[PDB]
């Protein structure tokens, strides 16, 4: 009796939320930007090709200087590349070879990694002796680590396979905040420009907005049909983009609290593994399982370009802070810079 | 100036490349195996005979290194992390003896996944003695869960062990054919299945994998020259 009426109340609340969202929807994004000049054909070329990794690449992260980047490979390796000269800076072996994510600190003095070992390893790059050693090993997650992003040199936000997210405090080893509410595996997280909020997508075809300080879920966004594998914030921070296994990408607005635009095509069947925005947010870059990457016009939902240089699936891609180039990794153990 | 910094960068790069060459030489000489069980399959005893989300075990057979990984502290939803094992040497799938239907469903999902379609599976039908004693007792039957066992006939290619009654031989060969049908329903020469009648305490099991992976490697070589 209690469960049935609780479910009825939850259904009524969902009906009210959907009614409010429908009432707030007066016009679509397609007709608003129908009068603007289309972006036209765009063509990017491969300028650099990073070689040296033995196994498939799982994650990459650009540094704040838009020059140094970090790459993670399941051979058990973290490699720091200088994209300008292609020279390798640091080669860090990993205790666990099943790495799935890597992070670069904004200050550039630390790096992070994690994977099937359920342990977030933080390595110091500016050691006195010059060698790279593990600075911290945060433990407590009961699932595989999927993503991690630094807030500062002493705080980090991580996502795990235990359907929960964590906010840790370095130099103590204890997670100060726990975010719960997801039912599926959390696959990716994206920090807002003000760092106050962050969006995380899970395997329940839903994304959730979490406030870092207080630590509750503020908004929940649905609309995808399969697991969400990628997420990225808009440059202005009032919206975000999600890529899922349903071969579609979606744009959600924080203030509108509903989906704004869907990017898909009939010939695209494979899912989306990575996604990111450009400097101005006009172009949306998404990595696909068909060994190719698609650049879409975010305002008009029109495909603007195709980046095809990888012989295997694209697992990760990122855009520099200045927006001068885009780095794409793939399972073929190669990283490519496109400009 | 630019010259000194670039020279230091070249020196660090060449040292890194030398270390990576040594690491690649080490890495290409070892085989990685993914150990998976359907539940209460007894693979823990096999591990004993040779928190943290994964466990590692390294063993040498005939001067050949093998690194087997067992998943621990991971939720029952395997559809995401299993993709990390798409380039291992083989997946050792242990099946006890309706848990059998669930094991068959897991094997069908592993067999038909896009990332694992070129990965071979070594099947270990563990607890042969338990199945033999259950068949001899007769209290538990397979026809209630698998009616097709009523019309099943022992294949002419069967090689039963001496002293084994025909009933247990028929039951174990029917269980093997249950997985064989799924394995042969797909996988047109890209991957193969190696069923084995094993117990949790046999010392030959380590040999068995050694006899399977080698075969796989040979087939892979035969795929490189377009001979098979």
């Amino acid at each position, epitope marked *: 009796s209690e469960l049935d009426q609780l479910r009825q109340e939850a259904e009524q609340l969902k009906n009210q939320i959907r009614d409010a969202r429908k009432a707030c929807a007066d016009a679509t994004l397609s007709q608003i930007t129908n009068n603007i000049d289309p972006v036209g054909r765009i063509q990017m070329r491969t300028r650099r090709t990073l070689r040296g990794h033995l196994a498939k690449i799982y994650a990459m992260h650009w540094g704040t200087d838009s020059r140094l980047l970090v790459s993670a490979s399941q051979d058990g390796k973290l490699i720091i590349w200088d994209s300008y000269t292609t020279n390798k800076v640091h080669a860090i072996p990993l205790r666990s070879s099943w790495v799935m994510t890597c992070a670069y600190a904004p200050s550039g003095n630390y790096v992070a990694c994690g994977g099937l070992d359920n342990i977030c390893s933080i390595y110091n790059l500016k050691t006195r002796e010059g060698n790279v050693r593990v600075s911290r090993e945060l433990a407590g997650h009961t699932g595989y680590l999927s993503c991690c992003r630094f807030l500062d040199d002493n705080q980090i936000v991580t996502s795990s396979g235990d359907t929960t997210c964590a906010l840790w405090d370095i130099e103590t080893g204890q997670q100060t905040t726990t975010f719960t509410g997801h039912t599926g595996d959390v696959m990716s997280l994206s920090l807002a420009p003000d760092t106050r909020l962050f969006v995380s997508g899970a395997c329940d075809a839903s994304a959730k907005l979490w406030d870092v300080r207080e630590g509750m879920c503020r908004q929940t966004f649905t609309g995808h049909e399969s697991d969400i594998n990628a997420i990225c914030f808009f440059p202005n921070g009032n919206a975000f983009a999600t890529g899922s296994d349903d071969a579609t990408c979606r744009l959600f607005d924080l203030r509108a609290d509903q989906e704004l635009m869907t990017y898909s095509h009939d010939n695209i069947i494979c899912g989306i593994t990575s996604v990111s925005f450009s400097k101005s947010g006009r172009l949306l870059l998404a990595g696909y399982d068909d060994f190719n990457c698609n650049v879409w016009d975010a305002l008009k939902a029109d495909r603007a370009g195709v980046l095809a240089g990888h012989d295997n699936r694209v697992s990760c891609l990122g855009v520099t802070d200045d927006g001068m180039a885009v780095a794409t990794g793939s399972w073929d153990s190669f990283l490519k810079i496109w400009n | 100036d630019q010259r000194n910094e670039e020279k230091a960068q070249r020196e660090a790069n060449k040292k890194i490349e030398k270390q990576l060459q040594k690491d690649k030489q080490v890495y290409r000489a070892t085989h990685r195996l993914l150990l998976l069980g359907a539940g209460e399959s007894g693979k823990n005893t096999i591990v004993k005979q040779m928190t943290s989300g994964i466990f590692e075990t390294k063993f040498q057979v005939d001067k050949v290194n093998f690194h087997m990984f067992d998943v621990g502290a991971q939720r029952d939803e395997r559809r995401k992390w299993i993709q990390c094992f798409n380039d291992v040497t083989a997946i050792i799938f242990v099946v006890a003896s309706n848990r059998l239907q669930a094991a068959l469903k897991l094997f069908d999902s592993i067999w038909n*996944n896009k990332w694992l379609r070129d990965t071979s599976v070594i099947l270990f039908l563990n607890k042969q003695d338990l199945l033999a004693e259950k068949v001899l007792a007769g209290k538990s039957k397979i026809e*209630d869960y698998f009616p097709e066992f009523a019309r099943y006939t022992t294949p002419e290619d069967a090689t039963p062990e001496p002293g084994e009654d025909p009933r247990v031989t028929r039951a174990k060969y029917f269980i093997r054919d249950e997985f064989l049908r799924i394995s042969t329903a797909s996988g047109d020469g890209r991957h193969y299945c190696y069923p084995h009648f094993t117990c949790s305490v046999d010392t030959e099991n380590i040999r068995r994998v050694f006899n399977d992976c080698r075969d796989i490697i040979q087939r892979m070589h035969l795929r490189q020259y377009e001979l098979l």
Partner: nanobody, 128 residues
Framework: QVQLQESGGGLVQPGGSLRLSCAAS????????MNWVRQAPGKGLEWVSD????????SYTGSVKGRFTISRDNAKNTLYLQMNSLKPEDTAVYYC?????????????????????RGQGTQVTVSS
């Protein structure tokens, strides 16, 4: 929003018949492979039957091979399970489940304890 609603079931005498229905919304039902599973009291979730996207590929478990019949209709975005010659061993909560990804041959995690793409099943009791 992916939504699955189960209808039908109840208390039936032994040897009776029943028709369970599964209504799907929030996704393209025509390109997903569907499953019927059950959870018996004091027991874990058990897979019962499955049907492909077009309905050509149909499979059942051994215990209901000759008794249950699974079907789908894409026009009304619906799924049906016809159960005949019911026995007290069939008393369980039945769930209608969807595969995590479309255009995908295999189907993972449908029998897991927590699964997002699974609705609230209906109770079927067989007793006199």
């Amino acid at each position: 929003q992916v939504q699955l609603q189960e209808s039908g079931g109840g208390l039936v005498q032994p040897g009776g018949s029943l028709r369970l229905s599964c209504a799907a919304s929030g996704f393209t039902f025509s390109n997903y492979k569907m499953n019927w599973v059950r959870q018996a009291p004091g027991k874990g979730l058990e897979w019962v039957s499955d049907i492909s996207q077009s309905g050509a590929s149909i499979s059942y478990t051994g215990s209901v091979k000759g008794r249950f019949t699974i079907s789908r209709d894409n026009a009304k975005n619906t799924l049906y399970l016809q159960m005949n010659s019911l026995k007290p061993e069939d008393t369980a909560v039945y769930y209608c489940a969807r595969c995590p990804a479309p255009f995908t041959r295999d189907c993972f995690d449908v029998t897991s304890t927590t699964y997002a793409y699974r609705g609230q099943g209906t109770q079927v009791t067989v007793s006199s």
